[PDB]
Short mmCIF file of C-alpha atoms and ligand atoms in Angstrom, two decimals:
data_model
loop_
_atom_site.label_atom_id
_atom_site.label_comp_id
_atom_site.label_asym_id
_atom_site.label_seq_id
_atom_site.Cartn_x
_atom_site.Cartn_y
_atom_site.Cartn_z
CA UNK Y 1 -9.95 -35.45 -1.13
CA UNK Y 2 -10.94 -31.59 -1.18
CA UNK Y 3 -9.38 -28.64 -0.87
CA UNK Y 4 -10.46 -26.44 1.65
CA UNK Y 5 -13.55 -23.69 1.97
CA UNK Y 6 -13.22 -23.38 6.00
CA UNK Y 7 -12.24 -23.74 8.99
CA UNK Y 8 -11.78 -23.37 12.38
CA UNK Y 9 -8.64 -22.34 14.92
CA UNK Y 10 -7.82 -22.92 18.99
CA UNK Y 11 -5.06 -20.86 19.32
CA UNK Y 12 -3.30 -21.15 23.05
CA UNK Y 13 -0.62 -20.74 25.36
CA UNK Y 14 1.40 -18.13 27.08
CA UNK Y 15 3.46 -14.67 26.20
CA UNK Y 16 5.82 -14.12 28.78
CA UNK Y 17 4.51 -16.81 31.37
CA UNK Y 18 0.71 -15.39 31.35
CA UNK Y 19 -1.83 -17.70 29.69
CA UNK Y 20 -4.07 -16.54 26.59
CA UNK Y 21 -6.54 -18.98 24.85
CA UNK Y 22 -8.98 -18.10 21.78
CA UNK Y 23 -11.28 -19.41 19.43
CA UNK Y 24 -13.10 -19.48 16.45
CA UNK Y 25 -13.82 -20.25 12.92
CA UNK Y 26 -13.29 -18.88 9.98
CA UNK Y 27 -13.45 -19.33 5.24
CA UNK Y 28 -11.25 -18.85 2.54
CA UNK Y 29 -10.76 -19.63 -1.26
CA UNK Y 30 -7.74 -22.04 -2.07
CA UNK Y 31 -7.95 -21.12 -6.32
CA UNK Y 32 -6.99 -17.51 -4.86
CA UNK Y 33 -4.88 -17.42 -1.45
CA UNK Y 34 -7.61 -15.43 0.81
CA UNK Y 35 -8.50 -16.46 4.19
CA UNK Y 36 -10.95 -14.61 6.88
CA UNK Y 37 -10.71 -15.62 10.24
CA UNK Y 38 -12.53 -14.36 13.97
CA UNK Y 39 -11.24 -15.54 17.08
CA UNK Y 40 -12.35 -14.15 20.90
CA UNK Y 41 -10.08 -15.21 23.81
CA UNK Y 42 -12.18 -17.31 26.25
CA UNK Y 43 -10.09 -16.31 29.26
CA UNK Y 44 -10.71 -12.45 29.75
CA UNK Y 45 -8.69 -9.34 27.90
CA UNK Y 46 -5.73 -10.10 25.80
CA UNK Y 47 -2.60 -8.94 27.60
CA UNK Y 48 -0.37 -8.72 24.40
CA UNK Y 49 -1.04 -7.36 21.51
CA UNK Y 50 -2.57 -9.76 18.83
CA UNK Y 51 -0.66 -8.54 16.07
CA UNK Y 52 2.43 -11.32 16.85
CA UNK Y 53 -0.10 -13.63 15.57
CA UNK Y 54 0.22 -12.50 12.49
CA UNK Y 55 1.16 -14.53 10.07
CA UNK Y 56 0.76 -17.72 12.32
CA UNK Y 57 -3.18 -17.55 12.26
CA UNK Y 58 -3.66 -22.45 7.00
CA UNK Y 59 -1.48 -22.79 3.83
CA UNK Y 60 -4.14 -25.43 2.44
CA UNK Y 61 -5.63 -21.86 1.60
CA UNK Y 62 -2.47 -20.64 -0.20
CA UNK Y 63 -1.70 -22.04 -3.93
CA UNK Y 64 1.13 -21.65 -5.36
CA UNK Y 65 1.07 -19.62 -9.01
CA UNK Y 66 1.30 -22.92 -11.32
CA UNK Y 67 -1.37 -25.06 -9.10
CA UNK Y 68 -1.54 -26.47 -5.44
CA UNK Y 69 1.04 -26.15 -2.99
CA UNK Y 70 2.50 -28.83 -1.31
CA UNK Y 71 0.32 -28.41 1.86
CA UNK Y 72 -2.86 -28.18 -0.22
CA UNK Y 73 -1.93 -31.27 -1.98
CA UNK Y 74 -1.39 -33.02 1.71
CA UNK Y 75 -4.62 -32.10 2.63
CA UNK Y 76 -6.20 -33.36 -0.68
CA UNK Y 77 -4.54 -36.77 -0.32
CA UNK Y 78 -5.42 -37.17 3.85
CA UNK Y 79 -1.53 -37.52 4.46
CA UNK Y 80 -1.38 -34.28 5.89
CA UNK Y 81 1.83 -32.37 7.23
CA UNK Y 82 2.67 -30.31 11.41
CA UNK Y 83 3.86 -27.04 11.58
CA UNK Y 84 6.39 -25.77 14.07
CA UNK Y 85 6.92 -21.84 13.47
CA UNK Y 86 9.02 -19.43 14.85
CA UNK Y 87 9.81 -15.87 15.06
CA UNK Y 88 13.07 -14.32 16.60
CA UNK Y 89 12.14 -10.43 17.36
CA UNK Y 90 15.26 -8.00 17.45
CA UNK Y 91 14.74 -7.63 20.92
CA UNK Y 92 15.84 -10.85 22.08
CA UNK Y 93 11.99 -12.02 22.51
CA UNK Y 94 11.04 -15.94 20.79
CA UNK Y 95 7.61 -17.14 19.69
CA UNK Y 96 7.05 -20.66 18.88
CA UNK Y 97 3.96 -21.45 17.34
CA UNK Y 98 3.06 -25.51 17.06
CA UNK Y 99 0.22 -26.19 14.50
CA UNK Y 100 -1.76 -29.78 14.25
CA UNK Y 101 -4.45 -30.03 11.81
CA UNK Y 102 -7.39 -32.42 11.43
CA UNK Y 103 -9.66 -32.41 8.12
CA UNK Y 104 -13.25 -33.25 7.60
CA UNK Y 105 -14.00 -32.81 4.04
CA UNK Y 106 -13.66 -29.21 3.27
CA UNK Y 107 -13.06 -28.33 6.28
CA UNK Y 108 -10.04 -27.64 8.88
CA UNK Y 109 -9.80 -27.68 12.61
CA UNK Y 110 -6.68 -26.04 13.58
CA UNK Y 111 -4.79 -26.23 17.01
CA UNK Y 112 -2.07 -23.55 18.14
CA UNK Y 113 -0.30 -23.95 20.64
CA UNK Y 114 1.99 -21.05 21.56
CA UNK Y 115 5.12 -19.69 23.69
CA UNK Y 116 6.18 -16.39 23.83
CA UNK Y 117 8.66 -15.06 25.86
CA UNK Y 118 11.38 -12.31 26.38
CA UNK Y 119 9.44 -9.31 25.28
CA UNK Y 120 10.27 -6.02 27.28
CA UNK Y 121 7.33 -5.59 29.62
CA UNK Y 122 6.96 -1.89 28.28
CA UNK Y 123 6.86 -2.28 25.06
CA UNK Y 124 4.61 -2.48 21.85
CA UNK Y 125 3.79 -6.11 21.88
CA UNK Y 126 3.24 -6.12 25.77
CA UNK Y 127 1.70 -2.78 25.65
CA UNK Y 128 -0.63 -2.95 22.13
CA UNK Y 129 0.58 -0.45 20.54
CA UNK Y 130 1.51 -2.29 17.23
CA UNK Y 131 -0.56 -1.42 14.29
CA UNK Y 132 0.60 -3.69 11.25
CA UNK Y 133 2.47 -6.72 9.78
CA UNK Y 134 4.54 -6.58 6.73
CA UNK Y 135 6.76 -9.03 5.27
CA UNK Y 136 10.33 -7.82 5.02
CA UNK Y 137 12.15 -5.52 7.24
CA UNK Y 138 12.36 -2.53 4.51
CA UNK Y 139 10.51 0.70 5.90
CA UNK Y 140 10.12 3.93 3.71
CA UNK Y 141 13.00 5.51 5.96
CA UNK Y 142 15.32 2.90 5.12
CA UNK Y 143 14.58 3.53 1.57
CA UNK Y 144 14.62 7.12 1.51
CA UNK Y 145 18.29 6.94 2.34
CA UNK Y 146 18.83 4.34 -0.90
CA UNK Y 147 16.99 7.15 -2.90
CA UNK Y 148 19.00 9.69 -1.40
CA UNK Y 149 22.64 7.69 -2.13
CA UNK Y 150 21.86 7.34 -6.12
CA UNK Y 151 19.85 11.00 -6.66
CA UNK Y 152 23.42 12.30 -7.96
CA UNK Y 153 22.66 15.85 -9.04
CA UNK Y 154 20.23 15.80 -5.61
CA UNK Y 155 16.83 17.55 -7.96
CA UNK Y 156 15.11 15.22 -5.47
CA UNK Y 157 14.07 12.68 -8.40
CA UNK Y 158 15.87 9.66 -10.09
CA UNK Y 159 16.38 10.61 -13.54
CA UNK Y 160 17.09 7.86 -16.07
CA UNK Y 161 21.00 8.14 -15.53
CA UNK Y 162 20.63 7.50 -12.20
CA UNK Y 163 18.76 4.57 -12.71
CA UNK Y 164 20.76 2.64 -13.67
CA UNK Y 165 23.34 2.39 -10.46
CA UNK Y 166 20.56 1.68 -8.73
CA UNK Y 167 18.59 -0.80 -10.83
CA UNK Y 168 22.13 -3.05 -10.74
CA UNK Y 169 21.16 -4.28 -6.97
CA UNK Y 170 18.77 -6.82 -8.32
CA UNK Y 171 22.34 -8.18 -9.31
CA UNK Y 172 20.41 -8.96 -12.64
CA UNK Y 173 22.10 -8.96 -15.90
CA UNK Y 174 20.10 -6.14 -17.96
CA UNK Y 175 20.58 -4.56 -21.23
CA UNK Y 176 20.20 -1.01 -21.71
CA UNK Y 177 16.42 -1.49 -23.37
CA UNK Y 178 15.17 -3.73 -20.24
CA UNK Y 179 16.40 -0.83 -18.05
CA UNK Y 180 14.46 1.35 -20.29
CA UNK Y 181 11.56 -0.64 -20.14
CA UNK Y 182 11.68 -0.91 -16.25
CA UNK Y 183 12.44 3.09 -16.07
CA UNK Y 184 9.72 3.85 -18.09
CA UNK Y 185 7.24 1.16 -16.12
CA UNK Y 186 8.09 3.10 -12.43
CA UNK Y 187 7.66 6.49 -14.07
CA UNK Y 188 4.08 6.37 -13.59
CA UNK Y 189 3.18 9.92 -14.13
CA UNK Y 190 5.34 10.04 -17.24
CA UNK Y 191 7.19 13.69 -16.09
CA UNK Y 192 10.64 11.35 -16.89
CA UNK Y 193 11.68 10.97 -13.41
CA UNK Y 194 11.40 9.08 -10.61
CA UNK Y 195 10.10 10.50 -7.52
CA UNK Y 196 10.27 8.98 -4.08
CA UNK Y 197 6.62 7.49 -4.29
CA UNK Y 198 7.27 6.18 -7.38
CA UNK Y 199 10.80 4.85 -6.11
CA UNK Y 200 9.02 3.25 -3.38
CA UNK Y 201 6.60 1.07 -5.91
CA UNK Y 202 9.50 0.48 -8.09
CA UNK Y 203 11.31 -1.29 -5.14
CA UNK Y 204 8.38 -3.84 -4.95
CA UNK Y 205 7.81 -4.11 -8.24
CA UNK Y 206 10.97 -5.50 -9.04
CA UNK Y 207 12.16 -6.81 -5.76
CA UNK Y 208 15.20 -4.22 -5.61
CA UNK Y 209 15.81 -5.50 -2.05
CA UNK Y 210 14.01 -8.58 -1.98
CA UNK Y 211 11.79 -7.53 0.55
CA UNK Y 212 9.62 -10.25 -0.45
CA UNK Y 213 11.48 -13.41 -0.90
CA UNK Y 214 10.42 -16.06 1.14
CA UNK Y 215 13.33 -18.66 0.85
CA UNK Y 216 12.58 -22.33 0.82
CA UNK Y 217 15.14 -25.11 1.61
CA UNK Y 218 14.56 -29.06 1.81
CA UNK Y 219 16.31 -30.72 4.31
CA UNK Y 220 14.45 -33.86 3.47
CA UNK Y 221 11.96 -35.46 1.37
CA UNK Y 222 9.25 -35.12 4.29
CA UNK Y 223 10.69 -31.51 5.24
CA UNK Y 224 10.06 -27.81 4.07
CA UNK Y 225 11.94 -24.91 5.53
CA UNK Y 226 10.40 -21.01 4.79
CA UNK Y 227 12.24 -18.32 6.10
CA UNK Y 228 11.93 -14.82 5.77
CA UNK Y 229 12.42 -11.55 7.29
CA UNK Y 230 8.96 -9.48 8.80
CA UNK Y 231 8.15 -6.59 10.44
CA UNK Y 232 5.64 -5.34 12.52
CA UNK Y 233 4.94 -1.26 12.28
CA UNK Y 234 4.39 0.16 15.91
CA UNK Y 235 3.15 3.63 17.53
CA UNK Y 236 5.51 5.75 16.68
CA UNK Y 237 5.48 4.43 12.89
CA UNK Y 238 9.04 2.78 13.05
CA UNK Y 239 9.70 -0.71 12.53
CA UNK Y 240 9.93 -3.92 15.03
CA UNK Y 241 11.72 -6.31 12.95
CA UNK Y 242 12.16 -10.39 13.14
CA UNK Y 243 12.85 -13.34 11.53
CA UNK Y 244 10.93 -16.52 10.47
CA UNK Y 245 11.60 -20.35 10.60
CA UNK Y 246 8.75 -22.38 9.54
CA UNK Y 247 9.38 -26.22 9.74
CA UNK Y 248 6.59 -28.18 8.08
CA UNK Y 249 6.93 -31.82 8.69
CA UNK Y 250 5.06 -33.69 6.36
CA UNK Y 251 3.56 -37.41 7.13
CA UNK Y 252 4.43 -38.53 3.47
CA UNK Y 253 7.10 -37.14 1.31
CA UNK Y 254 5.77 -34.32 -0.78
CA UNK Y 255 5.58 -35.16 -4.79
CA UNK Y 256 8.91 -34.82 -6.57
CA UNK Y 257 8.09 -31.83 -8.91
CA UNK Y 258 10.25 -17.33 -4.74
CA UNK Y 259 8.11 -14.51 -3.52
CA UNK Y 260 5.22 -14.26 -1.44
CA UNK Y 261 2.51 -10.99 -1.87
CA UNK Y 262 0.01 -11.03 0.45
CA UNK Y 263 -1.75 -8.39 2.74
CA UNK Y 264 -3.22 -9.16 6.35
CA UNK Y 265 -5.52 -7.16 8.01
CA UNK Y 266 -6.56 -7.23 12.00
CA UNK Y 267 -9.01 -5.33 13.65
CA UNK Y 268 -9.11 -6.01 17.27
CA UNK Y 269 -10.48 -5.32 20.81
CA UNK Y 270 -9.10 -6.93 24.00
CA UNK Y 271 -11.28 -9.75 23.65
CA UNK Y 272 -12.04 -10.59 19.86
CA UNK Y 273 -10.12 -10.27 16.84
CA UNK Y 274 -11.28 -10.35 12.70
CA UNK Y 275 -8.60 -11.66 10.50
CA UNK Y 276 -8.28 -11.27 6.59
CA UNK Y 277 -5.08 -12.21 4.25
CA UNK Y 278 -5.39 -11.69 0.87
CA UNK Y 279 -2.77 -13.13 -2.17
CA UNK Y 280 -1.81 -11.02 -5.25
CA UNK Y 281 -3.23 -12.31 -8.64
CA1 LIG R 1 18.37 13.36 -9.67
CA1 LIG R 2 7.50 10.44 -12.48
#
């Protein structure tokens, strides 16, 4: 009948045939979307880095803007819903992450059980050297070439002519005052132009390339799809990109009646990790 204010994760299972196990327990707030979580691996020095964890390490945390989302309202009612994600990595590699869930009151217990495989033995996830998650697969190199394509008289900055070619890939229909409004909203220094950091804002801002859409489908009434695109950022700052199936199953079908903002941070040695996702306002 609650909503949840902790909880606790065993997260297990192998990346590319070697076992890993961890543990530990963790809080959030479910009115605003943030969850901290600490976990230490109970069989010796992670192997891989912990980062492709990230996002699988509790949406009974994570409302949705007009109220509770359908897995907080599963918890709330006891039915309760699985989880079976997965992420497809650009170099061939697969991660499947199974989730089960028990409740007792406001809290969670959490199981993960996990199989990685397929990732090069030399690189970042086998060898640590990762150093962020992100949804989307836009980096600021990708988008420097965008900026590049529309800066017409090349002066380095989008001027309010300019704008508008580029302001058309939302594929929104837009009169010539909401462009002015949205010009005038990315021009944060007010010098009339926009320059690249400003571009780069913009872009999220109003979801120029949807780098933030988190697409949900309904196969059934007991059944939500999200899928997405992600990214982790690795040593040499460039971008290791996947894609991401979550099946929820749930036990009872979900009450008849998008974009996702969130950070995540990790900080983490070879044999303990501290977790914290936080939800935009
Ligand atoms: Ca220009
Ligand atoms: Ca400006």
């Amino acid at each position: 009948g609650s909503l949840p204010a902790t909880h606790e994760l065993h997260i297990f299972g192998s990346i590319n045939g070697v076992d890993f196990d961890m543990v530990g327990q963790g809080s959030g707030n479910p009115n605003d979307g943030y969850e901290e979580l600490n976990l230490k691996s109970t069989k010796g020095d992670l192997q891989f880095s912990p980062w492709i964890l990230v996002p699988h390490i509790f949406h009974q945390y994570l409302p949705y803007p007009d109220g509770m989302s359908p897995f907080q309202a599963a918890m709330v009612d006891g039915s309760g819903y699985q989880v079976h994600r997965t992420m497809q990595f650009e170099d061939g590699a697969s991660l499947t992450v199974n989730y089960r869930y028990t409740y007792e009151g406001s809290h969670i217990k959490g199981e993960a059980q996990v199989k990685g495989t397929g990732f090069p033995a030399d690189g970042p996830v086998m060898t640590n050297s990762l150093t962020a998650a992100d949804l989307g697969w836009d980096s600021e190199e990708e988008l420097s070439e965008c900026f590049r394509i529309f800066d017409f008289d090349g002066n380095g900055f989008i001027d309010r002519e300019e704008f508008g070619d580029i302001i058309r890939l939302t594929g929104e229909q837009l009169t010539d005052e909401d462009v002015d409004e949205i010009f005038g909203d990315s021009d944060t220094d007010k010098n009339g132009r926009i320059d690249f950091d400003e571009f780069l804002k913009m872009v999220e801002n109003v979801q120029l390339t949807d780098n933030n859409r988190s697409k949900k489908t309904y196969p059934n009434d007991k059944t939500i799809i999200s899928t997405y695109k992600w990214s982790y950022t690795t040593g040499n700052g460039k971008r290791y990109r996947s894609t991401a199936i979550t099946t929820y199953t749930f036990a009872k079908p979900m009450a008849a009646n998008m974009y996702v903002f969130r950070k995540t941070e990790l900080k983490h040695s070879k044999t303990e990790l501290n977790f914290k996702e936080w939800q935009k306002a």
